Scaffold this active site. Structure first.
Site, PDB file in Angstrom:
ATOM      1  CG  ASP B  14      -1.835  -1.243   1.221  1.00 43.26           C
ATOM      2  OD1 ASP B  14      -1.464  -2.195   1.939  1.00 43.26           O
ATOM      3  OD2 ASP B  14      -2.887  -1.266   0.546  1.00 43.26           O
ATOM      4  CD  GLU B 180      -9.355  -2.878  -2.466  1.00 41.54           C
ATOM      5  OE1 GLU B 180      -8.434  -3.699  -2.663  1.00 41.54           O
ATOM      6  OE2 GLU B 180     -10.389  -3.152  -1.819  1.00 41.54           O
TER       7      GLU B 180
END
Ligand SMILES: [Ca+2]
Ligand SMILES: [Ca+2]
Lengths: 511, 511
Positions: B14, B180
């Site tokens: 991430d 997302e």
């Protein structure tokens, strides 16, 4: 500090050492490798670097027809009156006649005003009765040559150019096969004779004698053997072939050869040079390591520690070939270059594969670890069948393991082992075009190869789970006296075209 | 120059990046590892070093009960008006009630005047409807939080301390599961929304939209997906979860997460952070790498190259724990020390083995290569059954591979694997007393251990030919979101005695 044996790791048999001032110099046998007689330098007896060689083709000896583990072996370096003397033995391929002289080996004498050379052209002393020549001068300045069997003393002209008569054996030895590696030493009136006995195998040892006078009689030492390995589980074996040296601070040390069994009785890296102290007794004898055999950890000599530039990464940018490299036999100077593409070591593809004695320009450095990595960036474009270039883990013509970019119905990356004369292809994968990264990963007796296109993602090309054949004993050669080398090569097969293989760098990582 | 992906190798999922002046800063998820949110620094977008963390127990969040691949994940770093904002999600072990609030995860907001902290104490924003929060300010200075599903826009107080009302979805996405990783960007009037779609698996991709106004309507991009891996043979896979950044020279680059399959669909090292350029079209869209997918070799950013101190050898001499280390969950500060024996990292033997969630003081750094070595010098003296300390290759409580000096009817060196919850002893050898050298040798999916007494002679303790279980997919954990770590540990078993295990140094060698 402390140090761990062997101090000079890798292919380094038959050590011989002298101290001159603050410097220490070592010579080791090289057999078929060129240049001949590797000369090393140390300031603390622990850290050594190669500084040159004794025979560099400017003094032209030729090894292009010398057999595996034949040629230049067992050197002795000495220093008297501003001259460095290297005596060595050239073992011939077989019985050869030179002046009504059935000889199988010859003694060589070179000399120079500097340890690294250039030395004089090799002067032959055709005394083929023994091996391991060592140079000795007495207090009267008379020069002598010691040869096997045991201690046979040869007077020399001033000159050291030929025997000046009368051979005589001053010490017979103790017993045990191959009493050799003779060395004399004059210390407080006494003459100390040093021998290697038991054979260079696992019964190797150091035995000494002593006499009031040069020509004897010599009495045996009551501590014989003063150095040997009696523990077959110890990681250092085959200890012997020693020589003594005294430091500027009054300490005494002995270098000797030893082997590191690599998961069994396999000296994969070859015989190396170990170090251990010498302690003097009150009855006038000396002993190596308090008769405790080869040390694994040892108190370092009382000298300022000086560690060297390892030179484990060679970007091939300097105009000179780095001194850590060796050629298998004489180079083909027409087919190798550092100047045809600066920053690259160019190998034009020769006409012979590594299994032939006539293969040329195999450039290899010593393996100093059982756990190491060897990498290469390669710019190569094979166009016809057989054209190949890459990395090789090399022991001899009958025992190597190669990984190369090759044309074999298109670009292929190929892994081939030569195991005791038996060729086998361990793997073959399609190869894309362009610069290639090859990595030799050595894990004890397991060795594998990986290829990459950017140095970031590696793919398995092939490997072996048993590399015991890359050793003295595993090679099964009639003489396993060298050691496994890792390096680069290039040949056409094959199609006698000179295809250029440009190696940008070589990288050695002890992990 | 050129560079090879991923730029920030090892466990780095991430990614999120900002430029402030000449500096670039990255944050990555850390899950159960402490301290939380690893903060990295670069000057050329290629070479990164860890400079600190976001939550360091001074702002006290506790992970001692957080499950594997739960906890702090998906951070976003941002910079507005001299304040650095890190928004992140804390995924809970399960459904938990906080203020009549059935929540499984919570959003966290920390801030600081410096990128490396100390940040403020984590302020919770209990909006458990989505993941991957990102911070966005508009030209009017209003602060917003983006959350999944897709782009749901949350207004914030000034303040960024709580939602100031009205959630609304500005972009639904294209389609594909798990839309997302929302990101907004204002460039020439337009608002660009960035998404991650397809799931963090192998269908991962980057899709974008665009609108004249913040609240929509947003039109899809005609180049979607602007980044994905469609070549299943490429060494880089699972590309997605990207964020854009613009350099001081006007270039545009995108960091994203990616996986390196390690001989199969096994992301042994975990998800890493990759780099690729952003090119702008004439119809007002941007594309990553000219729609060519993740690059293996790439033109480096037009920035002065600055390479960092790797810190692959830690002699444990500095008083501070090096920033490349991580604790599995919160440390037990009573049982670890760099000051009880300076030069050594002391680990007192804890009461729990690595397979328990309550094990403490497992100190590990990231694996950045599929071919590497990991070594340790250890001073340890186990006296009772179970007391052990050594090296571990660690993924999670159900998946690790350890090698330790242990008392088990005398000193033993033991190799134990935990493979998907199944413990097995891969080897056990008698151990002599004294300082010990342990070496973890990692060769793709083969991993072995070696012990030594002087660092010179190594002996095989044990190993595995299949380490696929040390990966995201091979671990078989319900969530494999981290990556394999290598480090040190110590526990008593066992006999609840605090036996001191003194690690003199740690050594990491990419071979
Ligand atoms: Ca170069
Ligand atoms: Ca230390």
């Amino acid at each position: 500090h402390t140090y761990t044996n062997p101090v000079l790791t890798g292919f380094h048999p038959d050590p011989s050492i002298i101290r001159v001032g603050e410097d220490y110099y070592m010579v080791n046998s090289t057999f078929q490798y060129f240049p001949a007689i590797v000369i090393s330098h140390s300031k603390d007896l622990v850290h050594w670097k190669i500084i040159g060689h004794g025979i560099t083709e400017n003094e032209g000896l030729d090894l292009s027809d010398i057999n595996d583990s034949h040629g230049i072996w067992a050197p002795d370096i000495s220093y008297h009156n501003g001259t460095f003397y290297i005596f060595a033995t050239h073992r011939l391929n077989g019985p050869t006649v030179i002046n009504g002289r059935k000889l199988i080996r010859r003694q060589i004498m070179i000399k120079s005003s500097r340890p690294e050379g250039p030395y004089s052209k090799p002067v032959f002393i055709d005394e083929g009765s023994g091996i391991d020549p060592s140079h000795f001068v007495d207090g009267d300045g008379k020069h002598y040559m010691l040869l096997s069997p045991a201690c046979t003393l040869f007077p020399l002209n001033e000159e050291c150019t030929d025997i000046s008569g009368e051979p005589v054996q001053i010490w017979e030895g103790t017993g045990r096969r191959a009493p050799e590696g003779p060395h004399l030493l004059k210390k407080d009136g006494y003459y100390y004779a040093i021998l290697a006995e038991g054979g260079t195998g696992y019964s190797h040892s150091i035995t000494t004698a002593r006499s009031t006078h040069l020509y004897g009689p010599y009495e045996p030492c009551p501590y014989n053997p003063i150095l040997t390995q009696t523990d077959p589980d110890a990681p250092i074996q085959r200890a012997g072939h020693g020589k003594l040296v005294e430091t500027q601070n009054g300490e005494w040390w002995a270098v000797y050869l030893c082997g590191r069994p690599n998961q069994g009785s396999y000296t994969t890296v070859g015989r190396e040079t170990a170090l251990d102290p010498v302690e003097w007794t009150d009855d006038g004898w000396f002993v190596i390591n308090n008769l405790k055999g080869p040390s694994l950890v040892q108190r370092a000599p009382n000298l300022p520690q000086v560690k060297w530039d390892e030179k484990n990464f060679d970007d091939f940018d300097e105009d000179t070939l780095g001194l850590d490299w060796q050629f298998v036999r004489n180079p083909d100077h027409s087919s190798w270059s550092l100047i045809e593409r600066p920053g690259y070591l160019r190998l034009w593809t020769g006409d012979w594969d590594l299994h032939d004695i006539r293969a040329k320009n195999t450039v290899v450095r010593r393996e100093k670890h059982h756990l190491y990595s060897a990498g290469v960036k390669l710019d190569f474009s094979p166009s016809a069948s057989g054209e190949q270039a890459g990395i090789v883990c090399y022991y001899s013509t009958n025992n190597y393991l190669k990984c190369c970019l090759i044309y074999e119905e298109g670009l292929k990356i190929k892994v081939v082992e030569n195991r005791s004369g038996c060729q086998k292809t361990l793997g073959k994968k399609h190869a894309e075009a362009g610069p290639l990264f090859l990595k030799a990963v050595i894990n004890k007796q397991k060795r594998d190869f990986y290829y990459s296109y950017e140095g970031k993602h590696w793919h398995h090309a092939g490997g072996t789970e048993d590399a015991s054949f890359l050793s003295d004993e595993g090679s099964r050669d009639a003489k396993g006296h060298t050691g496994t080398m890792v390096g680069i090569f290039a040949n056409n097969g094959g199609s006698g075209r000179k295809a250029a293989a440009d190696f940008d760098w070589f990288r050695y990582i002890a992990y």
